[PDB]
Amino acid sequence: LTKVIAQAHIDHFTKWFERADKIVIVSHVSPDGDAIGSSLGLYHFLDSQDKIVNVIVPNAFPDFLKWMPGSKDILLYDRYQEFADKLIMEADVICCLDFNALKRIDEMSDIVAASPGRKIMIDHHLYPEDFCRITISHPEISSTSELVFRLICRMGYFSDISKEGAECIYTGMMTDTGGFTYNSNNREIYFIISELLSKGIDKDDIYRKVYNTYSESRLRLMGYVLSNMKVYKDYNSALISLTKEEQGKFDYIKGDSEGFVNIPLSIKNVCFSCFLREDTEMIKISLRSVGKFPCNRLAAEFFNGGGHLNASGGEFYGTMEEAVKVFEQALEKYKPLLKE
């Protein structure tokens, strides 16, 4: 209902949109629900308007997103580089969805940077770069999928958002707010959800497809990791870990530890959570916080990593007990910050 996106930006893109024959949509490395949801949401709309549209991402997306209509036609850059490169170089318009810095598309950077096609960014992350000619940057909005819905609506094409398109948009809104459990207080979110439901989507089924679709081994693994968790009561923090012996034992598949780092936050007075995993070769670190404790600051100092305020990661080249000791240093240094 409220006009968040600048009308001038909407006017400009509409010009590009009407002139364009060939359009490419790009999103970030290791794309997730909102990367794929926003991209596929835009794809379905654009494809309904007699346009050649291809979605290209650097990297495979999780299997729990395969159900999404159009997902099979998403082009993986690390498997069809030459083909993708041609599409990118020849695109009249390149839509950059759910990232704001060329490093977020890891190896696609150069071809995207070089292409003479007209670039527009549609994103909700903080601190955007100026590689796009049109920049729609709204970090106050909780997902890129919502911005895509908003853009299409403001252009006057709400009626051309299909059931399939709506499914993809809802999926991204859902995943980026943890099923509307964080950063979701805004009223207009729920009007948008209602609008998407009017397109025939089944939001409950979509929840199940994304979150209630994984192996017996994965869930037993989650339980084992939780059984062996370490809580530091004076530091409002929790630690969980997986070794190579533990991973191999439970038959670890890629993406099995996804979300594990969040579970310890469901303990009362635990606002900061760390997960340590040995790689296939040393210690991978995942950090999560609830509230305002800066995950990205600790990661940058103690694990040469980074990311966002509430979710970060990085590697530590050493051993488990050695990596655990480093984690215990950071807890000690930022102890006063945690107590606030």
Residues near Na ion (CB under 5 A) = 4-5, 32-34, 100, 123, 125, 128, 137, 150, 175-176, 183, 185
Alpha-carbon distance 22 to 301, whole Å? 44
Give the span between the Cα atoms of 176 and 37, in whole angstroms: 10
Least Cβ distance, residue 125 to Na ion (angstroms): 4
Q: Report whether 288 belongs to an annotated binding site.
A: yes
Nearer residue to Na ion within complex by CB, 137 or 236: 137
Position with the least CB separation from Na ion: 137
Cα separation of 38 and 45, whole Å?
Answer: 11
**Neighbour tally for 267: CB within 10 Å:** 13
Residue 167 vs 176, nearer CB to Na ion? 176
9 a known binding residue? Answer: no
How far apart are the C-alpha atoms of 314 and 261, rounded to whole Å?
13
For the chain, the distance separating the N- and C-terminal CA atoms, rounded to the nearest angstrom, is: 37
Q: How far is the CB of 252 from Na ion (least distance, A)?
A: 22
Residue whose CB is less far from Na ion, 59 or 137: 137
Residue 44 assigned as binding residue: no
Give, for 94, the enclosing helix (H) or strand (E). Answer: strand 93-97
Helices (H), the chain: 7-19, 33-48, 81-90, 109-114, 144-154, 163-176, 188-197, 203-211, 216-227, 244-249, 295-302, 320-333, 335-339
* Token pair recorded at residue 287: 């950090």
CB 74 within 8 A of CB 38: no
Nearest distance, CB of residue 111 and Na ion, angstroms? 21
Q: At 118, is the secondary structure helix, strand, or coil?
A: strand
Q: Are 95 and 112 in contact (CB under 8 A)?
A: no
Supply the minimum distance, in Å, between the C-beta of residue 169 and Na ion: 12
Whether residue 200 is annotated as binding a ligand: the answer is: no
Least separation in angstroms between CB 35 and Na ion: 7
- Residue 27 or residue 247: which is nearer to Na ion going by CB? 27
State the nearest-atom distance from the C-beta of 328 to Na ion, in Å.
31
Whose Cβ is closer to Na ion: residue 175's or residue 241's? 175
Our CB check for Na ion shows the closer of 123 and 167 to be 123
Let me know the angle formed at the C-alpha of 38 by 36 and 41, rounded to the nearest 5 degrees.
100
Please check if 103 is assigned to a binding site.
no
Is 202 annotated as belonging to a binding site?
no
Do the annotations mark residue 249 as ligand-binding? Answer: no
312 marked as binding residue: no
124 annotated binding-site participant: yes
Nearer to Na ion, 135 or 273 (CB): 135
Angle in degrees, CA 164, 166, 171, rounded to 5: 100
- CA dist list (Å): 96 to 47, 159, 193, 208: 17, 24, 24, 29
**What is the spatial distance between Cα 125 and Cα 292, in angstroms, rounded to a whole number?**
17
Tell whether 291 is in a known binding site: no
Residue among 179 and 326 whose Cβ is closer to Na ion: 179
CB of 327 to Na ion, least distance (A): 26
> To the nearest whole angstrom, how small is the minimum distance from the Cβ of residue 311 to Na ion?
10
Long-range contacts, 246-249 (Cβ 8 Å, 24+): 247/277, 247/278
The binding site comprises 28, 32, 34, 98, 124, 176, 284, 286, 288, 313
The binding site for GMP comprises 284, 286, 288, 313
The binding site for Mn(2+) comprises 28, 32, 34, 98, 124, 176
